[PDB]
Every structure is written in structure tokens, then in C-alpha cells.
Design a protein around this ligand. Structure first.
Ligand code: NA
Length: 129
């Protein structure tokens, strides 16, 4: 599923992401835009052989099991395919584990490079929330 911007913002809000560990909703929407262009089916392979899955591009080296990333962990305890669902619950629940891991949203390279220190509230302007 390809979300609309406000539709995703609402979904994320309902799933407890607004201000989760102090990151306002616009942060999460901004990270999704640049990670996946709001497409839950997004996948991208990394140089190390791991793959990033879903709306927030969660990596198989640490967070999910895809059966093809040797020596990897599965810290969210989920098949990576669950991250591709039109239902974002598994992605959100795993993202909450990731953002709590030490480095905050800096874990998402696109957040650090394209969202951090920008007017992220712009991503939810106009939405009914
Ligand atoms: Na893994």
C-alpha cells in the first residue's frame, strides 16, 4: 500500500508514535517519505547482503529474519515480510524498539540526512489529527 501523507500520519498517531521517545509525528512521516516514499512494499538490498524492508526500511542484519542474512539477529522477532504489510503495526512496533536502542532516530540514515534539523512539522500540516 502506498499511503497518503495525512493517512500515514493518522495511522502512526494511532499506533503511539507521536512524541515517542520525544520524536514528534512529523519526524516519523518525514523518515517514511524518504525511506520508502510511503510504500509499505519497499525493499532495498545493502552492500553487506542485508535488506531493508517496508515503510521505515528496517534492516535484516539486526531487526528481522529474512532467511538470507548470515550471522544476523532478529531483535523484533518477526519475519521481514511482516514489515511489508498494508497494516503498519509490525513496522511501528519494531521502530519503537529501534529508536529506543541508543541512537534515537539517527538509526535511519535518511532521517539524519534529510529530516533532522528541518521543519518537520511541515509533514503533518493540513492533516486532521
Ligand atoms: Na536477521
Amino acid at each position: 500500500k502506498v499511503f497518503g501523507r495525512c493517512e500515514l500520519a493518522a495511522a502512526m498517531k494511532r499506533h503511539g508514535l507521536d512524541n515517542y521517545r520525544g520524536y514528534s509525528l512529523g519526524n516519523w512521516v518525514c523518515a517514511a517519505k524518504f525511506e520508502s516514499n510511503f510504500n509499505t512494499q519497499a525493499t532495498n538490498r545493502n552492500t553487506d547482503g542485508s535488506t531493508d524492508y517496508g515503510i521505515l526500511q528496517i534492516n535484516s542484519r539486526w531487526w528481522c529474519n529474512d532467511g538470507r542474512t548470515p550471522g544476523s539477529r532478529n531483535l523484533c522477532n518477526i519475519p521481514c515480510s511482516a514489515l511489508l504489510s498494508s497494516d503498519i503495526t509490525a513496522s511501528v512496533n519494531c521502530a519503537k524498539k529501534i529508536v529506543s536502542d541508543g541512537n534515537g532516530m539517527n538509526a535511519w540514515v535518511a532521517w539524519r540526512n534529510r529530516c533532522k534539523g528541518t521543519d518537520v512539522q511541515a509533514w503533518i500540516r493540513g492533516c486532521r489529527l
